Amino acid sequence: MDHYLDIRLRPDPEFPPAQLMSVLFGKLHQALVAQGGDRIGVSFPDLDESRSRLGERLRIHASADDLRALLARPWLEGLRDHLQFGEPAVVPHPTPYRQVSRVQAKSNPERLRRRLMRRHDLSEEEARKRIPDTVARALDLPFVTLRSQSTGQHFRLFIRHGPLQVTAEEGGFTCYGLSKGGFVPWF
Amino acid sequence: LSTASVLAFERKLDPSDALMSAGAWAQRDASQEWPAVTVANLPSDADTLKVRFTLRVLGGAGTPSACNDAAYRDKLLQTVATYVNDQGFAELARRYAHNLANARFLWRNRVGAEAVEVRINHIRQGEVARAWRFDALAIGLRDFKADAELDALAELIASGLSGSGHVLLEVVAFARIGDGQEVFPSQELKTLYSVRDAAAIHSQKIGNALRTIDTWYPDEDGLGPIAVEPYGSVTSQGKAYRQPKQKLDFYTLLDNWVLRDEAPAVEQQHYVIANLIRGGVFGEA
C-alpha cells in the first residue's frame, strides 16, 4: 500500500557495503520454504553503469500483507517509539517503462558442461568433433552478483530483458521471488 | 610532568576462542555430547547452534605492564584512583554485561535467528556457583539501559575489574538459526578457521563484540554503539571516525587528563578507561 518509508542518508556501523549489499535482500525471510506468507516484492530503481558498479542504495518495494498479517510474532519490532512519524508520502502517479527483472536464468551450467550434453544410458563413439565450441568468445558480466555456498566470484548471468509489464505479483505464482513486472517509479 | 616514551597495557577482559558446535534441540540441558562442525557438509537433524567461550575478568586498570617514567606512572595511577573513588567500574560493567546479555559475539550467525538464549555461569571451581539465562532477541542491543537481574552480572564484573574477587565466566549461546543451514566460522589466509577439526571464532573477534560499548561520540546518538578504539574507526564499512582535529579522541583525552588535570562535567571518561581495559601499546614518543 501507501505505508512505505525511506530513511535519509546516514552512515550505518552495522552493514558493510562490500560483498553482501546486493545479495541478502530477502534471504532472511521464510519465502524459500513458503510455509506461511508468500508475498514479497523485489525492485531495483538504480540502473547506473559507469565503472564496475550497478546498484548501491536500498529502495525495494514489498507487498501490503507482509507488514500487517505476517508480523503477529516479534520479528521486526522493538523500534516502535523511536521517532514521531511526520507528513505522509504519496504513491507516485507517474511511472516509466524501465523496471529490471531476474527470473528464469538457469539453462546450461558452466562448472559442469561436457556431460550434460549426451547421457541417455548409452555409449560415446563420436564425441570429439560434434560441434565447434571454439568459434564464439565473449567476456562481460555487468549483472548483480548474488552468491550462495561454494561459489567463486560469481557463477554467471546474462541479460535476458524484454519481459516487462505494469502488473505486480500475484498469489500462488512464484518462480524465484518475483513475478512479471511490478510497480516502482523513479521519484 | 610529561608523557613517557615506552608504555603498554595488558588485555583485561580476555575471552578465549569460542568453539561452535551444532546439535538438535530438546537436548539442551543434556548437552554434554553435542558434536561440532566436522569438516564441510552440514546436516538437517541439528537445528540450533552452541557457542562456548570462557572469559576472565582480571583486575587493575591503569597499572602498565611496562612503563618508562615513574612520575608519569604515579600520576596515571592517581588519575585512575580519582576515577575509581568517584564511582566503581559498574557503569562500564553494565555495558559489558549488555554485550554479554545478547549473543552479539555471533556476528552474522545471529542475524537471521528465531530464538537465541545466552547462559553465563560464574564458576569458582568445576562446580557452578551462580547461573544466568537471557533471551538475546528480547533484550535491547541498542540502548535505554534497562533490564532487571542483570545488575548482579554488572556488579560481578565491577568487582572483578576493581579486583574484589577472581571472576571466571563460562558462557554458552544457543542460536536457533534454523533447521541446519550452513553457518559461517572465521576465515584464515579461503579456508574456514578451525581449532582441532572443530570450527570456531577468533578471540579477538569474540572480544570485539565485548568492547562494542561506545554510544558516546561526536555525532548524535541515533546509530548506536561502536567498538572502543583509539582513533575510533570502522575497518570494512569504511567510515574512520573520531578525527584528531576535534578533541574527542583517546590520546587527546588521555594526555590532557593525566598531564593537565581536566575536570569539567566530562564524566564520559568511560571511553578512556575502556581503552585502558582494552590495553595496547599506547604511543609513545
UniProtKB/Swiss-Prot annotation, chain A:
Site (Substrate binding): S148
Cofactor binding summary note: Metal-ion independent.
EC class of the enzyme, as a word: hydrolase
E.C. code: 3.1.-.-
Alphabetized UniProt keyword annotations: Antiviral defense, Endonuclease, Hydrolase, Nuclease, RNA-binding
Active site: H29
Mutagenesis or variant effect for H29A: No pre-crRNA cleavage, still binds crRNA. Does not support formation of the Csy ribonucleoprotein complex
Role according to the record: CRISPR (clustered regularly interspaced short palindromic repeat) is an adaptive immune system that provides protection against mobile genetic elements (viruses, transposable elements and conjugative plasmids). CRISPR clusters contain sequences complementary to antecedent mobile elements and target invading nucleic acids. CRISPR clusters are transcribed and processed into CRISPR RNA (crRNA). Processes pre-crRNA into individual crRNA units. Absolutely required for crRNA production or stability.
Extra remark: In this bacteria, Y.pestis-subtype CRISPRs do not confer resistance to phage DMS3 or MP22, but instead are required for DMS3-dependent inhibition of biofilm formation and possibly motility.
Official protein name in the record: CRISPR-associated endonuclease Cas6/Csy4
Gene source species: Pseudomonas aeruginosa (strain UCBPP-PA14)
